[PDB]
């Protein structure tokens, strides 16, 4: 099923779909939004629905040492990797901090 993430403004965006010509590897329109934190917080939202809070979460993952502003001149890119089965392998990698942390969520058999 459709699976978007929580993007800036407490809102879901289907930035990648079940049938994104799988498998594939998208690496754009993905940035850390959390001014009020120093971390990234992906929430994984099954369902088609604008608001993130109104859409079926079953998944989330976090990684600390991050900012939108160059508070410590970070280096962060978050990837949308879609697997053959259509699993969303959602991955944040800090090249500056040397952190990697990544999360795998199916996008099938659900409602």
Curated annotation (Swiss-Prot):
The modification N6-succinyllysine is found at residue 106. The modification N6-acetyllysine is found at residue 25. Disruption phenotype: Non-essential; synthetic lethality is seen in a triple tig-dnaK-dnaJ disruption, although this depends on temperature (triple disruptions grow slowly at 20 and 34 degrees Celsius but not at all at 43 degrees) and strain background. Changing residue 40 to I: In SEG-2; confers temperature sensitivity. It is found in: Cytoplasm; Cell inner membrane. Coiled coil: none annotated. Changing residue 59 to D: In dnaK756(TS); confers temperature sensitivity. Autophosphorylated; GrpE inhibits the autophosphorylation. It comes from the Bacteria. Belongs to the heat shock protein 70 family. Plays an essential role in the initiation of phage lambda DNA replication, where it acts in an ATP-dependent fashion with the DnaJ protein to release lambda O and P proteins from the preprimosomal complex. DnaK is also involved in chromosomal DNA replication, possibly through an analogous interaction with the DnaA protein. Also participates actively in the response to hyperosmotic shock. In pull-down experiments interacts with CedA. This is Chaperone protein DnaK. It comes from Escherichia coli (strain K12).
């Amino acid at each position: 099923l459709s699976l978007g993430i929580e993007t800036m403004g407490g809102v879901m965006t289907t930035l990648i779909a079940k049938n994104t010509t799988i498998p594939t590897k998208h690496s754009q329109v993905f940035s850390t939004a959390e001014d009020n934190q120093s971390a990234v917080t992906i929430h994984v939202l099954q369902g088609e629905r604008k608001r993130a809070a109104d859409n079926k979460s079953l998944g989330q993952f976090n990684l600390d040492g991050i900012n939108p502003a160059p508070r410590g001149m970070p280096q962060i890119e978050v990837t949308f990797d879609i697997d053959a089965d259509g699993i969303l392998h959602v991955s944040a990698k800090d090249k500056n901090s040397g952190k990697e942390q990544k999360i795998t969520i199916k996008a099938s058999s659900g409602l």
